[PDB]
């Protein structure tokens, strides 16, 4: 799809057998999802955003289906205000910026 | 230009007579730039991000030339760690997401 930016670029995703809605976020290096149950092991980590930092759990080789396109890689989980799909997964689905 | 996301989508902008680099940020509603000197009168505002909220100065009808494309609208100034061009200006330059 081509997506214009008059509204938030929210897409429906499937991760860990659950369905969520998430922002296509070119300003985010990594993918960060609100607290959710996800299988397996994780390493603790801190990521910095606008207002400061949050502690997240890092999950590697996690599968996500974003608008029907599968991708696998790193998903951070913790108290983000919105689910954010970052560049780490955006490049896998072939997402680009055009003007 | 088409912009792929293997790297941060950093763009050169000119605002208030100064040259900055800013992030093309689909995940941001508004444009927020680090502390810098801008002409007019501003309004006090608080915006929320990953780590919580920051106080910013709201400036309206501000001119920015983003990758040599002119736009006018709201710019928030305050302690963001990176300069971010948000959707409020991205729509003006014809910027879209594609996959
Ligand atoms: C995260 C979400 C809440 C919206 N944010 C936009 C998002 O692209 C921000 C922009 C940003 C923030 C801090 C440092 C660099 C870039 N990126 C973002 O927070 O991403 C996170 C996770 O991935 C990481 O790489 C960048 C820093 C890390 S935001 O905090 O910057 C924001 C919030 C409110 C507004 C508003 O206009 O109200 C605008 C922008």
CSV table of C-alpha atoms and ligand atoms in Angstrom, one decimal:
chain,number,residue,atom,x,y,z
A,1,UNK,CA,0.0,0.0,0.0
A,2,UNK,CA,0.8,3.7,-0.3
A,3,UNK,CA,0.0,5.6,2.9
A,4,UNK,CA,-0.5,9.3,3.3
A,5,UNK,CA,0.2,11.0,6.6
A,6,UNK,CA,-2.9,13.2,7.3
A,7,UNK,CA,-3.7,10.5,9.9
A,8,UNK,CA,-1.5,8.3,12.0
A,9,UNK,CA,-0.1,5.4,10.0
A,10,UNK,CA,-1.7,2.7,12.1
A,11,UNK,CA,-1.6,-0.8,10.9
A,12,UNK,CA,-3.0,-4.1,12.2
A,13,UNK,CA,-0.4,-6.6,13.3
A,14,UNK,CA,-0.2,-10.1,14.6
A,15,UNK,CA,2.4,-11.0,17.1
A,16,UNK,CA,2.5,-13.9,19.6
A,17,UNK,CA,-0.9,-15.1,18.4
A,18,UNK,CA,-2.4,-11.7,19.4
A,19,UNK,CA,-3.8,-8.9,17.2
A,20,UNK,CA,-2.7,-5.4,17.9
A,21,UNK,CA,-2.6,-2.0,16.1
A,22,UNK,CA,0.7,-0.3,15.7
A,23,UNK,CA,2.3,2.9,14.3
A,24,UNK,CA,4.6,2.7,11.2
A,25,UNK,CA,7.3,4.9,12.8
A,26,UNK,CA,10.2,6.0,10.6
A,27,UNK,CA,11.6,8.0,13.6
A,28,UNK,CA,12.1,4.8,15.6
A,29,UNK,CA,15.2,2.6,15.3
A,30,UNK,CA,13.5,-0.3,17.0
A,31,UNK,CA,10.1,-1.8,17.5
A,32,UNK,CA,8.5,-1.1,20.8
A,33,UNK,CA,5.3,-2.7,22.0
A,34,UNK,CA,3.2,-2.1,25.1
A,35,UNK,CA,3.2,-4.7,27.8
A,36,UNK,CA,1.9,-8.0,26.4
A,37,UNK,CA,2.6,-11.7,27.0
A,38,UNK,CA,5.3,-12.9,24.6
A,39,UNK,CA,6.9,-16.4,24.7
A,40,UNK,CA,10.5,-16.9,25.8
A,41,UNK,CA,13.7,-15.4,27.1
A,42,UNK,CA,14.6,-11.7,27.1
A,43,UNK,CA,17.3,-9.3,28.2
A,44,UNK,CA,16.6,-6.1,30.1
A,45,UNK,CA,17.4,-2.9,28.3
A,46,UNK,CA,16.8,0.9,28.4
A,47,UNK,CA,15.7,2.9,25.4
A,48,UNK,CA,15.6,6.7,25.2
A,49,UNK,CA,12.7,8.7,23.8
A,50,UNK,CA,11.3,12.2,24.0
A,51,UNK,CA,10.7,12.5,27.7
A,52,UNK,CA,13.5,10.3,28.9
A,53,UNK,CA,14.1,6.6,29.1
A,54,UNK,CA,12.1,3.4,29.8
A,55,UNK,CA,13.2,-0.1,30.8
A,56,UNK,CA,12.2,-2.6,28.2
A,57,UNK,CA,12.5,-6.4,27.7
A,58,UNK,CA,14.4,-7.3,24.5
A,59,UNK,CA,13.1,-10.3,22.5
A,60,UNK,CA,15.0,-11.5,19.4
A,61,UNK,CA,13.8,-13.4,16.4
A,62,UNK,CA,10.2,-12.6,17.2
A,63,UNK,CA,7.8,-13.1,14.3
A,64,UNK,CA,5.3,-10.3,13.4
A,65,UNK,CA,2.8,-10.1,10.6
A,66,UNK,CA,2.4,-6.4,9.7
A,67,UNK,CA,-0.3,-5.8,7.1
A,68,UNK,CA,0.1,-9.4,5.9
A,69,UNK,CA,3.9,-9.1,5.5
A,70,UNK,CA,5.8,-11.4,7.8
A,71,UNK,CA,8.9,-10.1,9.5
A,72,UNK,CA,11.2,-11.5,12.2
A,73,UNK,CA,13.6,-9.7,14.5
A,74,UNK,CA,13.8,-7.7,17.6
A,75,UNK,CA,10.8,-6.5,19.6
A,76,UNK,CA,11.1,-4.4,22.8
A,77,UNK,CA,8.4,-4.6,25.3
A,78,UNK,CA,7.6,-2.1,28.1
A,79,UNK,CA,5.7,0.9,29.1
A,80,UNK,CA,5.6,2.7,25.7
A,81,UNK,CA,2.4,4.9,25.2
A,82,UNK,CA,1.7,3.4,21.7
A,83,UNK,CA,2.8,0.3,19.9
A,84,UNK,CA,5.6,1.4,17.5
A,85,UNK,CA,6.9,-0.5,14.5
A,86,UNK,CA,10.5,0.7,13.9
A,87,UNK,CA,13.0,0.7,11.1
A,88,UNK,CA,14.3,-2.7,12.1
A,89,UNK,CA,11.1,-4.2,10.9
A,90,UNK,CA,10.1,-1.6,8.3
A,91,UNK,CA,13.0,-2.5,6.1
A,92,UNK,CA,11.9,-6.1,6.1
A,93,UNK,CA,8.4,-5.3,4.7
A,94,UNK,CA,10.0,-3.0,2.1
A,95,UNK,CA,8.6,0.2,3.5
A,96,UNK,CA,10.0,3.5,2.2
A,97,UNK,CA,9.4,7.2,2.4
A,98,UNK,CA,8.5,9.2,-0.8
A,99,UNK,CA,8.2,12.8,-1.6
B,1,UNK,CA,13.2,11.4,-3.5
B,2,UNK,CA,12.6,7.9,-2.4
B,3,UNK,CA,14.0,7.2,1.0
B,4,UNK,CA,14.7,3.7,2.3
B,5,UNK,CA,14.9,3.0,6.0
B,6,UNK,CA,18.1,1.0,6.5
B,7,UNK,CA,19.4,4.2,8.0
B,8,UNK,CA,17.7,7.0,9.9
B,9,UNK,CA,15.8,9.3,7.4
B,10,UNK,CA,17.8,12.4,8.2
B,11,UNK,CA,17.1,15.5,6.2
B,12,UNK,CA,18.7,19.0,6.1
B,13,UNK,CA,16.3,21.8,6.9
B,14,UNK,CA,16.5,25.5,7.2
B,15,UNK,CA,14.4,27.3,9.8
B,16,UNK,CA,14.7,30.8,11.3
B,17,UNK,CA,17.8,31.3,9.1
B,18,UNK,CA,19.7,28.3,10.5
B,19,UNK,CA,20.6,24.9,9.1
B,20,UNK,CA,19.7,21.7,11.0
B,21,UNK,CA,19.4,18.0,10.4
B,22,UNK,CA,16.0,16.5,11.3
B,23,UNK,CA,14.4,13.1,11.3
B,24,UNK,CA,11.5,12.4,8.9
B,25,UNK,CA,9.2,10.9,11.5
B,26,UNK,CA,5.9,9.3,10.6
B,27,UNK,CA,5.5,8.3,14.2
B,28,UNK,CA,5.3,12.0,15.3
B,29,UNK,CA,2.1,14.1,15.1
B,30,UNK,CA,3.9,17.4,15.4
B,31,UNK,CA,7.3,18.8,14.6
B,32,UNK,CA,9.7,19.2,17.6
B,33,UNK,CA,13.2,20.6,17.5
B,34,UNK,CA,15.9,21.0,20.1
B,35,UNK,CA,16.5,24.4,21.8
B,36,UNK,CA,17.2,27.1,19.2
B,37,UNK,CA,16.4,30.7,18.7
B,38,UNK,CA,13.2,31.4,16.7
B,39,UNK,CA,11.7,34.9,16.1
B,40,UNK,CA,8.1,35.3,17.2
B,41,UNK,CA,5.8,34.8,20.1
B,42,UNK,CA,5.3,31.3,21.5
B,43,UNK,CA,2.8,29.4,23.7
B,44,UNK,CA,3.5,27.0,26.5
B,45,UNK,CA,2.8,23.3,25.9
B,46,UNK,CA,3.4,19.8,27.0
B,47,UNK,CA,3.9,16.8,24.7
B,48,UNK,CA,4.3,13.1,25.6
B,49,UNK,CA,6.7,10.6,24.2
B,50,UNK,CA,8.4,7.3,25.0
B,51,UNK,CA,9.8,8.3,28.3
B,52,UNK,CA,7.0,10.7,29.4
B,53,UNK,CA,6.4,14.4,28.8
B,54,UNK,CA,8.4,17.5,28.1
B,55,UNK,CA,7.6,21.1,28.2
B,56,UNK,CA,7.9,22.9,24.9
B,57,UNK,CA,7.3,26.3,23.2
B,58,UNK,CA,4.7,26.2,20.6
B,59,UNK,CA,5.3,28.5,17.6
B,60,UNK,CA,2.7,28.8,14.8
B,61,UNK,CA,3.0,29.7,11.2
B,62,UNK,CA,6.8,29.0,11.2
B,63,UNK,CA,8.6,28.6,7.9
B,64,UNK,CA,10.8,25.5,7.3
B,65,UNK,CA,12.6,24.4,4.1
B,66,UNK,CA,12.9,20.6,4.5
B,67,UNK,CA,15.1,19.0,1.8
B,68,UNK,CA,14.5,22.2,-0.2
B,69,UNK,CA,10.7,21.9,0.1
B,70,UNK,CA,9.0,24.8,1.8
B,71,UNK,CA,6.3,24.4,4.5
B,72,UNK,CA,4.6,26.5,7.2
B,73,UNK,CA,3.0,25.3,10.4
B,74,UNK,CA,3.5,24.6,14.0
B,75,UNK,CA,7.0,23.9,15.4
B,76,UNK,CA,7.5,22.9,19.1
B,77,UNK,CA,10.8,23.8,20.6
B,78,UNK,CA,12.2,22.2,23.8
B,79,UNK,CA,14.3,19.4,25.1
B,80,UNK,CA,13.8,16.6,22.6
B,81,UNK,CA,17.0,14.7,22.0
B,82,UNK,CA,16.7,14.7,18.2
B,83,UNK,CA,15.1,17.1,15.8
B,84,UNK,CA,11.9,15.5,14.4
B,85,UNK,CA,9.8,16.5,11.4
B,86,UNK,CA,6.2,15.3,12.2
B,87,UNK,CA,3.2,14.6,10.1
B,88,UNK,CA,2.0,18.2,10.4
B,89,UNK,CA,4.8,19.2,8.0
B,90,UNK,CA,5.3,15.8,6.3
B,91,UNK,CA,1.9,16.1,4.6
B,92,UNK,CA,2.8,19.5,3.3
B,93,UNK,CA,5.9,18.2,1.4
B,94,UNK,CA,3.9,15.4,-0.1
B,95,UNK,CA,5.7,12.8,1.9
B,96,UNK,CA,4.1,9.2,1.9
B,97,UNK,CA,4.9,5.7,3.2
B,98,UNK,CA,5.1,2.9,0.7
B,99,UNK,CA,5.4,-0.9,0.9
C,1,LIG,C1,7.3,7.6,20.4
C,1,LIG,C2,6.0,8.2,20.2
C,1,LIG,C3,5.4,8.6,21.5
C,1,LIG,C4,6.1,9.4,19.2
C,1,LIG,N1,7.5,9.9,19.1
C,1,LIG,C5,7.9,9.9,17.7
C,1,LIG,C6,9.0,8.9,17.5
C,1,LIG,O1,9.4,8.7,16.1
C,1,LIG,C7,10.3,9.1,18.3
C,1,LIG,C8,11.1,10.3,17.7
C,1,LIG,C9,12.4,10.3,18.5
C,1,LIG,C10,12.3,10.5,19.9
C,1,LIG,C11,13.5,10.5,20.7
C,1,LIG,C12,14.7,10.4,20.1
C,1,LIG,C13,14.8,10.2,18.7
C,1,LIG,C14,13.6,10.2,17.9
C,1,LIG,N2,11.2,8.0,18.2
C,1,LIG,C15,11.1,7.1,19.3
C,1,LIG,O2,10.8,7.5,20.4
C,1,LIG,O3,11.7,5.9,19.1
C,1,LIG,C16,12.5,5.2,20.1
C,1,LIG,C17,12.5,3.6,20.0
C,1,LIG,O4,13.3,3.6,18.8
C,1,LIG,C18,14.4,4.4,19.2
C,1,LIG,O5,15.1,5.1,18.2
C,1,LIG,C19,14.8,6.5,18.4
C,1,LIG,C20,14.8,6.6,19.9
C,1,LIG,C21,14.0,5.4,20.2
C,1,LIG,S1,7.9,11.3,20.0
C,1,LIG,O6,8.1,11.0,21.4
C,1,LIG,O7,9.1,11.8,19.6
C,1,LIG,C22,6.6,12.5,19.8
C,1,LIG,C23,5.6,12.6,20.8
C,1,LIG,C24,4.6,13.6,20.7
C,1,LIG,C25,4.6,14.4,19.5
C,1,LIG,C26,3.6,15.4,19.3
C,1,LIG,O8,3.8,15.9,18.2
C,1,LIG,O9,2.8,15.4,20.3
C,1,LIG,C27,5.6,14.3,18.6
C,1,LIG,C28,6.6,13.3,18.7
